[PDB]
Symmetry: C6
Subunit: 182 residues, 6 copies
Amino acid sequence: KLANPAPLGLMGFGMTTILLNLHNAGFFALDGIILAMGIFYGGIAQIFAGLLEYKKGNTFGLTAFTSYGSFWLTLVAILLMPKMGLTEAPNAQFLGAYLGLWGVFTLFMFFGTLKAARALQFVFLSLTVLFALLAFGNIAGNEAVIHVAGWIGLVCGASAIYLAMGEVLNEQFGRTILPIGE
Amino acid sequence: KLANPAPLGLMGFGMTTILLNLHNAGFFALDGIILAMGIFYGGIAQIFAGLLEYKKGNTFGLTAFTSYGSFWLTLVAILLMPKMGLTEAPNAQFLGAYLGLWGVFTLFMFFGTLKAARALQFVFLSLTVLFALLAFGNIAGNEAVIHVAGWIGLVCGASAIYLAMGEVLNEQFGRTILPIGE
Amino acid sequence: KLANPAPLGLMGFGMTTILLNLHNAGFFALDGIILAMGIFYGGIAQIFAGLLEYKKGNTFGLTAFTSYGSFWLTLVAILLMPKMGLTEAPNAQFLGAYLGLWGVFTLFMFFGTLKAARALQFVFLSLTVLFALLAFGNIAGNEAVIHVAGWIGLVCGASAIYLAMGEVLNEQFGRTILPIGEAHLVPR
Amino acid sequence: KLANPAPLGLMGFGMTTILLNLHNAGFFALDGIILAMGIFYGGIAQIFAGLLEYKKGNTFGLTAFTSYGSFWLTLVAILLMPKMGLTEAPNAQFLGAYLGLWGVFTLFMFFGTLKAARALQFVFLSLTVLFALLAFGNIAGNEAVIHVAGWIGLVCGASAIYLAMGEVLNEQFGRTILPIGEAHLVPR
Amino acid sequence: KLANPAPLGLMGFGMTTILLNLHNAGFFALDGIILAMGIFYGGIAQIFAGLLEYKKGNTFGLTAFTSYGSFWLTLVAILLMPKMGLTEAPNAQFLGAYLGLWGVFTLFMFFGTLKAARALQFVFLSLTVLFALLAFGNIAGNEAVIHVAGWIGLVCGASAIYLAMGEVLNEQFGRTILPIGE
Amino acid sequence: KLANPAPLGLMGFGMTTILLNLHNAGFFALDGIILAMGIFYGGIAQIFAGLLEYKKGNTFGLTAFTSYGSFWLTLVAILLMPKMGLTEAPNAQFLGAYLGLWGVFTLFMFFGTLKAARALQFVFLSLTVLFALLAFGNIAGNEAVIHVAGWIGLVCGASAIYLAMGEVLNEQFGRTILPIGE
């Protein structure tokens, strides 16, 4: 059988999500830490994980990991293209619409997890909320909502890491080490 | 047994199409958000989706996704090469010709969808109209036509997202959740 | 059963050929539009089409698409590297020699299409003429020849798009929708 | 029968870990040597090793190598992007948080090695300690903790190289040349 | 069966070899024409052709095309790195030693073609001579020898194109259209 | 039935090794020639050769070629990043440690070759000595030792080219043309 690529994808998503949202929560400025993780781990590694779902027959995983890997690359390009003299910093309402579209994608995909493990359902539920809060905060110009999105993002990202490690450990031992609501 | 890559390609197309046409409908200036999405999601991710149709034996999909993924990359390059000092701003009538060719491609391909899902037919019909109106708009320098094109693009993009999530959810549940006319 | 990559390659070639030759025919200056298309569609997408011919066992398509995809990339690089301070602007006679070699390649490959669809023969015949005229035009500094070449290029590019869409539609419907002059029982 | 990619991944990880922690232990400044190795060997080569685990059915190795290859790339990018004018220099507490998350990942993965070779358990145990100490050191601004972490890192890196070469030699000779504590009949 | 990648490799090699050596012969300065062809066709396309020889079981082709594809990329980097402020223009004696090493490689590989088609033997014989002349010319500082190498390079490159097209046409028609001394 | 990729990797290693050590033996300054070869032939092509050993079931080769290909890329980056304004010139004692680690790797791998061709054993033994002498040389700042290392490197590189062409020619003729102790 082929390896399970989902833990790779979940880890890249989860760790990067936590780091971005430590900034959104207001602990840190928008550091190169986030941008670096967005490029290689949330971005490129997650895209690998999505592509690896193809031969596994997993349409959901292919769609999800490759899309959110692409999300991270788009976010980093949005943030860095002004540093390169290519564009201006984005209009925050337009950024909100973009985050909103990612939220709508996530909401539909959430309904797709309802016949899957509860842990995965929670990843997509909290991710839907995260995008919705980030979309609102940017469209309304409400920094308090962004701060709260940040905290939600910490839980979202942590839950993805939990799921990833539950999948690795449960496979390694051939039993439920970490329950993921299978 | 291979995964379905069409939702990936349709999502990349659909999201990026909506974002471009929020600018065309007159809500926002064109900034990095559109370009970032054009590079990585409407562009590269859609190209991945096209190449993944090869082993699925799907010529239409290989042709459509890889081409429209290429389209997004060409449009982004057209708009950023002037910022890089490599070219000057594109000629609008020339750009109109370029858009018209993409429209002609889309019209031929629309007749290809008559054998496929009704929702896919709507995507290609509305996409044909979108390219035609953006072509006329740029050639004739008619901003009112671009604006109408914008609204058509919002509907086109949304319909693509609808079909993508229909495909994912109908496969996840093993039954028609969202009717797409298949 | 693997997908047919030829329409992709033909589309990338055809669209890009048309845009370039709108310039050659004198309608527009050489624009970012041409360069962008040369990089990604005439270029990279056509290279993908060529590589996809390998597992289909199609030596001719592997050779053709990957080569002409490379042509488009070399052409964009010739034009942009001076903007990057990497090179000086190209010598016109040397450009003519380069176009001439692409022409010679195309002439030989044309003979490889004699058993293939008529529409594909037309693509390679007009392409041979297109390269020969561009080669002469640049070597001899004859703008009128370039303008004629431009028109031939529009026809060439358009015939490739026609062939691409015929292959797609004919496969989608499981019968001939757009006649492309497939060889059947009549000997070539 | 596919080759074993683990020695490649372990070597890239191990060498790069040693060089970084020669800096952490206070022997050298943070040099291009570390960054170069982080990009290509700890980084890209380790990513190749991870991807090669997919067809071997090895979820643990796919997850581990591709993740820690990405770690090395993110670390080099954090350090070089300010030189490129793309970002400002990293916040030390935020770097500590990042190192801490890598530490948490490593701790969970350590438990995944309990049925694997003892030498691999040692690699993941020392790596967990290594990340925890680097995390604390940066968060608390304690140089002494960083220096201790550095020494632990030399041991960690060295044990990975030992394990890599054991796997290579033991396979080459078809028997144990370097004991790595493979599980056999004794229950774990 | 898998496609034959040799004509691709031979074409990329052959066309690029002709263009470089129109300069070496003294017709033209060392134009971007050559550098562009060296990057994408003599370089990258030829590397593809080499990699495609792997599943064909062809050790000779894998070794030859991938190596000479790499040759072209090294030559272009040598020529462009000074334009990028990275290095000085190369020491010509050192360039000669480098060309000499490529000549030695080519000489051994020539002996490997002796049980293969005569046309291929001539490609490698003329290529050996080409490198030897370019090596001498640069080490001795003799521009006349470089000029003659240039002319030899035209014949070498043309012979590779001839072989490539002989392989394509002979396969297309299932007979000897162009004789290649099989 | 897959092609043998070892000649490719050995050639990339061998040529680039000879060129580097013409500088170390004191004939030339280090210029773009070495760096170009380090990037594309000693580097990338050797990496290709390593990855191609995977499906051949050859762990030693996957490990050796991909690692030494990576080595060349790291050395080139070390030397060019200062020219790019990204780092300062490397610390020689640090560089010595780095070279020593590569030597330690090479020594372990040498014991791996005792099961393989005698010519390959010579490549790894001489490579072990080369790394050891370059390490000592840089650490101790002893230029005489670097010089001796240079000559050892010329012999090491040449032996690699010999083995590569032995492998190609012995396979082409189906018999031992160049004895390599297999």
